[PDB]
Ligand SMILES: Cc1noc(C)c1C[C@@H](C)C(=O)N(C)C
Ligand SMILES: [Zn+2]
């Protein structure tokens with residue numbers, strides 16, 4: 001059962017206001033025919049326009065919420081809303097566009113999906129709360145057939161052009177007019193009581209209902225993200241590499257080792273409380289410190305309450321030494337902390353919009369992360385950039401310009417002139433640091449942290 005069988009039953013109750021008289025007994029096979037499409041017994045990679053919840057979760061990067069509202073149905077204008085915030089008005093003759101015929105609306109749909117999805121996914125998944133008009137509008141901008149490849153590259157085709165009779169992926173679709181072989185899922189098939197707004201609002205206060213199709217589209221996608229990544233979590237599902245995932249993860253390991261090592265050298269904490277991932281490894285294996293681990297999986301809904309992590313009776317004394325929260329998101333960090341906290345507001349191809357201000361960070365696995373909150377860091381300060389090294393000054397083995405920097409904490413800088421090895425290492429470390437920060441990570445530290453305390457570790 002890899003794909004959704006076309007013979008699966010589709011519940012039609014949510015469609016009967018736009019389509020009165022619709023049969024209660026309905027399959028996807030009959031629904032697709034009703035929508036004006038013909039599948040023609042084709043075993044050519046596209047068995048169904050609709051997909052399972054499991055297939056949708058694997059393709060979360062392709063999710064585009066889509067709603068269609070009657071402005072006044074072949075005789076009336078339709079308002080097409082997308083989770084990108086775009087509203088297009090199509091005439092049968094929060095960005096709002098005036099009424100235009102389908103032949104020009106379809107060109108805009110292809111451009112919008114292509115610009116949104118080219119760096120995210122090889123397809124589009126329209127996330128619906130299906131009431132009828134959205135399904136009956138698909139024939140005006142969607143074409144289906146066998147799975148195809150792009151005319152300018154090896155990627156699967158996502159667009160079709162009636163002008164040249166050619167197919168293209170999202171990267172080569174300029175001037176194309178039809179969406180080709182899209183996928184879709186109706187959230188209303190999962191079992192819900194009441195309307196979209198009532199189900200959405202139970203879990204989210206960030207998306208309002210300004211009474212336009214894009215608002216419904218955003219709410220629909222947000223509800224689907226809630227059901228698949230907030231209430232239900234799956235860290236076994238792997239997502240493909242689309243950007244700087246590897247460099248970011250390597251940079252995070254590099255920065256964690258640097259900051260913790262320097263905090264231990266500078267303040268000589270006798271104990272470190274490492275709170276978070278139950279599979280964590282000591283990030284500074286050679287440190288003298290008593291290293292104590294506390295297990296907590298990533299919180300996907302609300303940030304952990306510090307009172308629940310630390311209290312209810314273990315070292316017990318979390319006030320002794322220092323606490324390390326490396327992506328362990330809590331409501332309020334204690335004053336004696338070293339923290340790495342993901343900023344959900346960051347714009348990136350890895351960070352997708354999420355539920356209630358949270359974001360869906362997709363890097364190898366999907367992590368719904370609670371909304372960034374500046375008040376979590378009230379007992380701490382921002383950690384400044386610095387590079388520390390006690391490794392010997394020796395090159396071994398890329399042309400040079402001498403490094404001058406007050407934040408290169410090395411024996412050679414203490415001595416007055418940074419060596420080639422430490423200049424190369426400082427520049428590689430600065431690039432890794434900038435990669436981590438630009439990915440959305442934020443670093444915070446106990447207020448007494450002072451890099452001036454590292455200079456005397458060179459005796
Ligand atoms: C946890 C967590 N909190 O915010 C984000 C973002 C993550 C996930 C990320 C750090 C990651 O790649 N992990 C754990 C393997
Ligand atoms: Zn292409």
Ligand SMILES: [Zn+2]
Pocket residue numbers: 200204205206207218219222223354355356
């Ligand atoms: Zn929402």
Ligand SMILES: [Zn+2]
Pocket residue numbers: 392393394410411412413418419420421422
């Ligand atoms: Zn040196």
